[PDB]
Write a protein that binds this DNA or RNA. Sequence first.
DNA 1: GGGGCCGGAAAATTTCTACGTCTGCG
DNA 2: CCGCAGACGTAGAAATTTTCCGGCCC
Length: 293
Amino acid sequence: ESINPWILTGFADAEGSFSLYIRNTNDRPSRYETRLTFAIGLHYKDKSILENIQSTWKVGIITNAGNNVVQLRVSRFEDLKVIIDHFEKYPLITQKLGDYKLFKQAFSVMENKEHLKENGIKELVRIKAKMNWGLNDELKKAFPENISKERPLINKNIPNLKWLAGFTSGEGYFGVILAKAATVQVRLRFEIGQHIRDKNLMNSLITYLGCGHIYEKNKSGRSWLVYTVTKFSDISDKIIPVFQKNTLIGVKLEDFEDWCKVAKLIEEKKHLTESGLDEIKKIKLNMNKGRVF
DNA sequence: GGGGCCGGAAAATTTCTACGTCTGCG
DNA sequence: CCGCAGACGTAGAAATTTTCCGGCCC
Ligand SMILES: [Ca+2]
Ligand SMILES: [Ca+2]
């Protein structure tokens, strides 16, 4: 099977990373190891997606990262052209685009075979210093002048609903909340978490989907925004119809279907009856984390 | 030949997904 | 009072990254 190119980009914004590995490998003459890698790590539950991504790009190796996680890795340099080609037509809009643009700069250095010289390594370590989590402590002390490269910031809009379909397939959550004598209410909930570095992008969802709210949640010293929709009228009229015209991917798609089954049962006002609550309870206990198959 | 390149597993780190609740409201 | 839902919590694991041996192969 295959995946829509914008959906894949939306999924690449959610999951997947751009890696640059640098390592000292010799010293009699000083040499360094350099490798680029794009990798999407998923649960083996969604191994089908990686195979589908592998079916569209026709490159990359699926590895088993252990701990219930399979991973699609692409590292072959000639096969990297395929990925670059794709993301020029269907670009990322999150802050991962910055990690992507720096990833391309590393590709340019390795392509001109400059990474085999002292000038290329010194340039590459500056690129890595602004990518993801930056340089390791070894390279920080080996190359002290490593804060020269500019981290390209990103302020982009949502390209279309096709991108949103892929972004929801990764970060989305369709939950049937059974809120609990004054405690037995049924609630449908659709929320999306994201790092606060993409606050502008997250807030665009409210104006783009014409509904929803955003709440910041803190764990220890970390922070992430959560775009949330709870109003049922906004769900049945604005949230559900969107993901129907633009189909999701993975097992999250069937989670969406069961999420719709409850919605149709709620609009029919069967969620306030004894009978209609039974099939809802059966649905909620067999979806998301409630299912293992 | 030999050294950069690459299949492949896996540790490091955290940003997610999942799922409640308290509370005011009409 | 019942039902809706805004605002706001925590668990913990599916994720985001980084790691590098062995050994093809240009
Ligand atoms: Ca993400
Ligand atoms: Ca996901």
